[PDB]
Every structure is written in structure tokens, then in C-alpha cells.
Amino acid sequence: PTVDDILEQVGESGWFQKQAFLILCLLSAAFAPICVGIVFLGFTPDHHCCQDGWVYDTPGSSIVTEFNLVCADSWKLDLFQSCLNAGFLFGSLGVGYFADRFGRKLCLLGTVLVNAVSGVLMAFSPNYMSMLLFRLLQGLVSKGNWMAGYTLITEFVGSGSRRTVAIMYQMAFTVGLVALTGLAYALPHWRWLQLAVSLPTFLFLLYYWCVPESPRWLLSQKRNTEAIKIMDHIAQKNGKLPPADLKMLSLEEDVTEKLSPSFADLFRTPRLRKRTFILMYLWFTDSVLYQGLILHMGATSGNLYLDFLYSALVEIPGAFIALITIDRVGRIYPMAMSNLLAGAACLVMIFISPDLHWLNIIIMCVGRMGITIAIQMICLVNAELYPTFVRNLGVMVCSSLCDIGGIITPFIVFRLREVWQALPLILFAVLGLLAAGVTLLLPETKGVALPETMKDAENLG
Ligand SMILES: CN(C)C(=N)NC(=N)N
């Protein structure tokens, strides 16, 4: 009588779960401005390049118009993204035990309050060093918020709807990007845009007090009283009678009362070590090949609004395709096919002359669908292939190996565009195709109802 059976008897997609998913959807739209937002507000309109300073003629005011970073400190924007991505690295190494042991829901609430305060302080920051440190904190806190929220969603949802609710969460992320574009068009000033982004965070915390904790992680602490309380509250919420308390409670005496995120037992079991290595390779791929592809995309009209509108309308067809095909053939074959398609798209620009009609749109479309389907696979698979005391140690393969991609892709492309114009495409295609062909074949399996039964990490092998 695992908690999934209790949720099934109480209704996995009841009204209470609907409002909880709405609340964390409101959280999801608050994560896009942290990562995607920069291309809008940190965008130089024009540069005059004695010099005698530089003046940009545009009604909007970006970060570089107000800090004068056009020529003397042009690399500061790269330094700014490097500092944000090092914030992601600091989060990946930091919010583990510090994100679980103090109370998972309470940690999420404290961090979302911290994010609100730090964003408001970014709105009123009349310097640069404080701005950089605050962006470090913003990156760390926002990554922690989004991963904790997503894993909480895949914890509440019972077996049979994890794919649906997670893919709807990613659709909410894409809708957050679309709303970012809309609010960007609403007013070009970065200050008011940041202040308007910070208000969904208030709307989150204001109503986030009533959301309960994760029942399974709470059961992992051998505290089943309030766990049974919250399960019966959920059951009575969506018009259902409570189940048997003894069946609902699972003692699981072999489980440690506290958590010990393994820094050395990850490689103890060969299945877990192999899964972690495969996910490391796959994650590196993903942002690697990605910002790579984005960079290789042509100049979109407008370059600040229609660029985002065209980039965001890619995901939603991909999200719907994933929703349709993720269960009929499992969560391995569709994403493997998408990655092979992305590799073939990367390899086709080299041997085919660009003068052919519609070649640019064909390659951009195929690559992008491939590395949207890859991302909406890998997030769900990393969430599924880790128990509750390993999922927060499972964020590191998500974020401590995508951070290296985000840091290093500008340098790799900067060297590649000089050494050989045909070099970066061959490198990206070779690494992506070889990795996604050898790997992503058997990273355990899919369709497993119990991810944190103390035997999920070993029985699948
Ligand atoms: C948010 N960033 C930078 C991504 N990795 N996007 C993506 N799904 N390739």
C-alpha cells in the first residue's frame, strides 16, 4: 500500500492538485526572466564606435545604456552571464542537505521570499558590484526554486499522470517565455520590467502557504502522523473518503531517519553510477549543442521581440508531440530519435551548400525540435531516476553539468569560428550523435510507479 495507491484512491488529478499545479505554474513563469530575460534587457541598441564616451539613441534603456559597457567593457556581459552561471554552480553544490533538512516546503518558501527581496533590490541597485553579487544570488536561488518546485510536482502526481503534469509544467515555462516577450514589448525599460517580474513572486508566496509538503519525503522521516493528516485532507478535499491509516502509513524501518546524500556511494552500485554518467553526458550535450545551435541561427527580424516569439513557438509543438508520444513507446525511443535527428541536422549543413532553398529554416526547425524533445525528456527522466533523498542530489547532474556547458560554449565557438568555419558543426554533430547513440539506450527504464522505494535505484538493473 504505497502512497501512490492512496493518491489513486483519493484522486491524482483532483481540484486541489489542479490549484497546486496552477500555483507552481505561476512559479514556472517566474523562472523564465532569470535565464531568458537577459537577451531582452541586456541588449545594446547601438554603439557609436577621440571616443569621448558613447551615447545610444533609443527610447528604451538597457543595462549597457545605463552602465556604458558598449566598448570599454563589452566583455562584462559575458562576465555577467558567467557570474550567473557560477551562481547556478554554487547552487548545485550548495542547496542539497541545506535544501532538504530544514524542511523542503519551508526551504522553498524561504528561498522564494529571498528571490523576491533580491529581485526588488536589483530593481534599485545604483552600482555594478552589488548588481553582480545580487545576480549571483538570483541565479542560485532561482535554480533551487525551480528544481524544488518541479520535483514537488512530480512527487504529488501519482502514477499515470507524471508525464502529463510535467509536460504541462514545461508548457507553462514556454508560456512564461511568451509572457516575457509580451511584458518586454509593454515597456522597454529594464527597471520596470524587473519590478513587474518580481510581482508574480509575491503572488506565489501569498497563496503558497496553504500548499502542503511532499507526503513521501515526509514519510521518509518516520513522521506519519501529519503525513496521514495531509493525505486525508487531500482525500476529503476532492470528495473522497480517507483510506485505512495502517495501510497508508509505510514504516520502512530499513530507511535511515535522516538523509545522507551519497558523495561516495553513488558509484557503489554500478547501475546508479552508470545512470549518473549517462545523464552527465546527455546533459552536457543538451546545453552544449543548444546554445551552440541558437548561435548558429540567422538574424531574426526585430531581433528582440520576434526572435523570442519565433523561438518560443518552437517548444509548444514539441511539447504537444512529446505529450502524445511519451507513453506509447516509453520515454527512451522518442528522445533518442529526436537526438539522432538533431545530430543529423547538425551534420547536414556541412555537406550541403547553404544556397539551397529553405535550408536554414529546415536545419533550424529540425535541430530545435530535437533539443526541445531532449530537454523535456531529460528533466523528467532525471526526476524519475532518483529517490527523494537522491533527487536533490540529482539536481547536480541537471545543473552542475549544464553550467559547464553554459560557461564553455562561448569560448568553444569563439575558438571554432577562427580555427575553421566547418569545425564547430562537425564537433557538435560528432559529440551529440555519438553520445546520444551510445548513451540514452538503456538508462534503466521508464513507466516505473515507485521512484523512491529504497530499491528503485537497483532493481531496474
Ligand atoms: C534555458 N537554457 C539556457 C536552455 N538550456 N534551454 C534549452 N532548453 N536548451
Author numbering: 2 to 50, 121 to 532
Can you provide the manuscript's text about this entry?
As part of the major facilitator superfamily (MFS), hOCT1 operates on an alternating access mechanism, allowing substrate-binding sites to be exposed alternately to either side of the membrane via transporter conformational changes. Each hOCT1 transport cycle involves transitioning from the outward open to the outward occluded, then inward occluded, and finally the inward open states.
In its outward open state, the hOCT1 metformin-binding site exposed extracellularly. The channel connecting the extracellular environment to the binding site is negatively charged, potentially enhancing selectivity for positively charged organic cation substrates. The shift from the outward open to the occluded state is characterized by the movement of the extracellular termini of the CTD helices, with the intracellular portions of these helices exhibiting minimal displacement.
